[PDB]
A paper describes a structure:
The receptor tyrosine kinase EphA2 interacts with ephrin (Efn) ligands to mediate bi‐directional signals that drive cellular sorting processes during tissue development. Efn ligands bind to the LBD and sterically seed clusters of Eph ECDs, which then drive forward signaling through tyrosine autophosphorylation of the Eph intracellular domains (ICDs).
To facilitate crystallization, we took advantage of optimized Fab frameworks that enhance the quantity and quality of Fab‐antigen crystals (Bruce et al., 2023, 2024). Briefly, we incorporated substitutions into the elbow region of the Fab heavy chain to reduce conformational flexibility, in addition to making substitutions in the light chain constant domain that reduce the surface entropy and induce the formation of β‐sheet stacking interactions between packing Fab molecules in the crystal lattice.
Numbering used by the authors:
A (entry chain E): 2 to 32, 39 to 58, 66 to 72, 74 to 80, 83 to 111, 115 to 220, 223 to 232
B (entry chain D): 1 to 9, 11 to 35, 40 to 64, 67 to 72, 74 to 240
The structure:
Amino acid sequence: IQMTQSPSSLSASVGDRVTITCRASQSVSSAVAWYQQKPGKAPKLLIYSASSLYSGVPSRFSGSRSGTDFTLTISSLQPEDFATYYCQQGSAPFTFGQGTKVEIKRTVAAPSVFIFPPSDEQLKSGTASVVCLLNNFYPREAKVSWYVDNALQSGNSQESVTEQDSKDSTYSLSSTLTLSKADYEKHKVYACEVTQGTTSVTKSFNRGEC
Amino acid sequence: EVQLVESGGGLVQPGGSLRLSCAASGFTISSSYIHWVRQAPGKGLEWVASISSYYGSTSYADSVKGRFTISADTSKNTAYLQMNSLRAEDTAVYYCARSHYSVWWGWHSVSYYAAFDYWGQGTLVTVSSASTKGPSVFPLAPSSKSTSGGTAALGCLVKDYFPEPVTVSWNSGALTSGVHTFPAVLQSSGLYSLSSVVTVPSSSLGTQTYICNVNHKPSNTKVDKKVEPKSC
Ligand SMILES: [Cl-]
Ligand SMILES: [Cl-]
Ligand SMILES: [Cl-]
Ligand SMILES: [Cl-]
Ligand SMILES: [Cl-]
Ligand code: NA
């Protein structure tokens, strides 16, 4: 007795009508539940008995059934509603659906960009970490390029992206370039280039600076 | 008033054993079915086990049968999930949860449907033979000469630690506006690394003090680092 969830991910704008659907392989009565999960947090119950709104849950959420198909509906999406939503059948063995990542769509937002040289303490370790920060931008995908003495760097950086902000639906991103102390010490100009649309910003520092 | 607090997660060698605790408050555990639900990192939700202390009935996700034992202690209003012979597939954040449908009738031949209304905070169970290593913590120093949005940025780089998690905080919890702590990333070394940043008024750079407080509970280590402009 399996639970196919659909779609796997969707983007929609504030106030849009969102519909997640779950497909039971057999008949699970009306014992199906819906949960909202923010990243790394415990899931919150939204709907139980396929249709009943859990106390505390905003009225914008509703559940419904049509045969073997249970659906969760958000009548007008709110920015705090980005999460992953799960269906669960309520009879044993309590199978969960695959999840539905709900990401929110908004205006293009310019990143505020900063670059950070490695610390002297990290230099006594024999490795340098250069970090490039892109703050409060949208959409998630942005081109970050690293330059060392105007040589494009490849294969020695790692990206991490934050979750969507719960009011403005923007992201922030870090790029961490890692080098040997010797490698960092033999080059002068460090630069992080961010491209988004028809605008590129390059932020830089010189190793000998204050 | 109803709360579910977990304990006993952490690192464990493959094949070893861990006992997870679930201390309930604000309701009697015999009136409820208690369940465990785990989530492997990046994957979805999987039900693992359930118990009702009143009926003496336990049930296990086939995926764990025989290796897991879920029990409860009424005197302590607490549930346990003892895990033996852990494998890498067992690495996950484990949650306890209360089913919303109470064992309402005192009659025995009654199957109850499950919907989880109260959840624990989640504890990470990591199944590797790697050693615990604490994080090195380095400043991310601003420049008054590198202003982006009228404001300045500064940070802490929290590098080469295992296992997760690491908690970062700024000025002993007194600074929260502008803070972004990034999701951790797993280096090629097999060690983790993340950074935490905060945006501040461009003027306050030299005037204000920014100390980041890094906590790595897996290695029982807490580091506080002052962040200053290089100032050579
Ligand atoms: Cl779409
Ligand atoms: Cl499941
Ligand atoms: Cl510079
Ligand atoms: Cl009830
Ligand atoms: Cl340190
Ligand atoms: Na972490």
